[PDB]
Design a protein around this ligand. Structure first.
Ligand SMILES: Cc1cc2nc3c(=O)[nH]c(=O)nc-3n(C[C@H](O)[C@H](O)[C@H](O)COP(=O)(O)OP(=O)(O)OC[C@H]3O[C@@H](n4cnc5c(N)ncnc54)[C@H](O)[C@@H]3O)c2cc1C
Ligand SMILES: CCOC(=O)NC(=O)c1cc(F)sc1NC(=O)c1nc2ccccc2s1
Length: 426
């Protein structure tokens, strides 16, 4: 029934051997969880999606890992209610394609589409539209949760079991296995975006641009920022902002299938500064999803609360002066948070940086953790593999509330992961 497999997260880092159960049969999954519960709990079980977490949240050294990707039935889509009913192994690319002919858009897309619905709920994922749509869990109308006792619980965001619903959102698999969910989609009349592009010369400008009001005009917003240059070039950004196009905004060619989804010597001088400015400045460009959104290393992502703007500028300065060079860097302003205790996003300045593994890096990121903590921010568990229990607990002050929900639903510690043990969420 199960195979011994060396599993890792996407950062190809911290390997651990587990029994991997890979079955299309939901029955077998129920029986395997019963097999784990009866056998004195042991080192437990965790669900796995497409393995796109950089962390260790989808591995369980010496325990059971349940591969959820063969549970990938789309049960129903309804254009009138905007509801899709899917198995938790359905991925967001598959969902996106199935839903478009109904005029329905996946309401939160992350930077990849190769992500399961289960993983999208359990990490409470966010994307380019967070300030207008919130995160994934805001759009879940119901889910079916396989709990430790072997019962499948039907959960909704309001009414009884709300607490457990909200513990499962961002719960990293630790309340049990999400089998099935109903999601409310966003109505759209096209597969396209109308996009504006802006380019700033400085961090001060980047911040000014993001707090001048203009963010209200766009449903989707994010930036690539410079993390290497000295100040005041540092934190200069290519900003890309837009919204879903309506049919009347498309060039005539596209109106018949509006829902179809099918170095050099100059580059470091003044001319390329102009090139990159021109090329990155535009208004009302029509773009598909690939052009607008989806075109060794240690990923590190954090958010600093909105008011702590001076503290945010200080952390960027520390990154640049550190001697650790990050080329691919995403900046976004998050909007309001939801009610999930372990949900990562909070209103404020979100950054994802990417460091090549060098001497000293492990210790440098520890200092960064400390600064993020002091400034009221937190790290994202989907990107993290190395932070301590202490640091994590102080960054998520609702963790105790969460833990008691978890102990209520899982008394025998039937659901467990490397991360759980490391972060003392067990
Ligand atoms: C290139 C790239 C870009 C990314 N961009 C973004 C982004 O823009 N925004 C963002 O928020 N995230 C982003 N991520 C992270 C990714 O969205 C999350 O890590 C997502 O959770 C991965 O889903 P997955 O199905 O691979 O789940 P896995 O990585 O396999 O599992 C992740 C967690 O979900 C739990 N889980 C999975 N399935 C189930 C289930 N059926 N029931 C209960 N728990 C389950 C696992 O136990 C584990 O805790 C990115 C990742 C990559 C590689
Ligand atoms: C590749 C898609 O890029 C985007 O447009 N991203 C966003 O808009 C966007 C907005 C946010 F709030 S968080 C985010 N993206 C991320 O967190 C990514 N992390 C990686 C790591 C490796 C490769 C690609 C990515 S994208």
């Amino acid at each position: 029934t199960t195979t011994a497999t060396r599993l890792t997260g996407w950062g190809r880092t911290a390997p651990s051997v587990a029994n991997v159960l890979r079955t299309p049969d939901a029955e077998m999954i129920v029986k395997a969880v019963a097999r784990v519960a009866e056998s004195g709990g042991g080192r437990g079980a965790i669900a796995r999606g497409l393995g796109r977490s950089y962390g260790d949240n989808a591995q369980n050294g010496g325990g059971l890992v349940i591969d959820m990707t063969p549970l990938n039935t789309i049960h129903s889509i309804d254009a009138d209610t905007k509801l899709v009913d899917i198995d938790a192994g359905v991925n967001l690319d598959q969902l996106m394609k199935a839903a478009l002919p109904f005029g329905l858009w996946v309401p939160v897309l992350p930077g990849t589409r190769q992500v399961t619905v289960g993983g999208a709920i359990a990490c409470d994922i966010h994307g380019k539209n967070h300030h207008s749509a919130g995160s994934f869990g805001n759009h879940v109308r119901s889910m079916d949760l396989l709990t430790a006792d072997g019962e499948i619980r039907h959960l909704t965001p309001t009414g009884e079991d709300a607490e457990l619903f909200w513990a499962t959102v961002g719960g990293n698999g630790l309340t049990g296995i999400i089998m099935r969910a109903t999601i409310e989609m966003t109505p759209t009349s096209t597969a396209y975006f109308i996009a504006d592009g802006d380019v700033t010369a400085s961090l001060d400008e980047t911040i000014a641009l993001h707090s001048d009001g203009s963010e209200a005009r766009y449903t989707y917003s994010s930036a690539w920022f410079d993390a290497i240059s000295a100040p005041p070039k540092l934190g200069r950004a290519a900003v890309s902002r837009g919204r879903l196009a309506t049919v009347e905004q498309l060039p005539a060619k596209l109106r018949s299938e509006p829902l179809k989804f099918d170095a050099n010597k100059y580059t470091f001088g003044p001319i390329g500064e102009l090139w990159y400015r021109k090329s990155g400045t535009y208004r009302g460009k029509v773009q598909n999803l690939t052009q607008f959104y989806h075109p060794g290393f240690l990923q590190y992502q954090f958010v600093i609360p909105t008011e702590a703007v001076d503290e945010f500028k200080k952390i960027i300065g520390v990154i640049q002066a550190s001697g650790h060079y990050s080329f691919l860097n995403v900046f976004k302003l998050f909007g309001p948070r939801n009610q999930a205790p372990l949900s990562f996003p909070i209103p404020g300045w979100n950054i994802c940086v990417d460091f090549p593994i060098k001497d000293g890096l492990g210790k440098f990121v520890s200092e960064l953790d400390r600064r993020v903590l002091e400034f009221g921010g937190r790290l994202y568990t989907a990107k993290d593999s190395r932070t301590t229990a202490e640091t994590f607990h102080a960054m998520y002050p609702r963790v105790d509330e969460w833990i008691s929900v978890r102990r209520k639903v899982d008394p025998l510690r039937v659901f467990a992961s490397d991360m759980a043990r490391r972060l003392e969420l067990l």
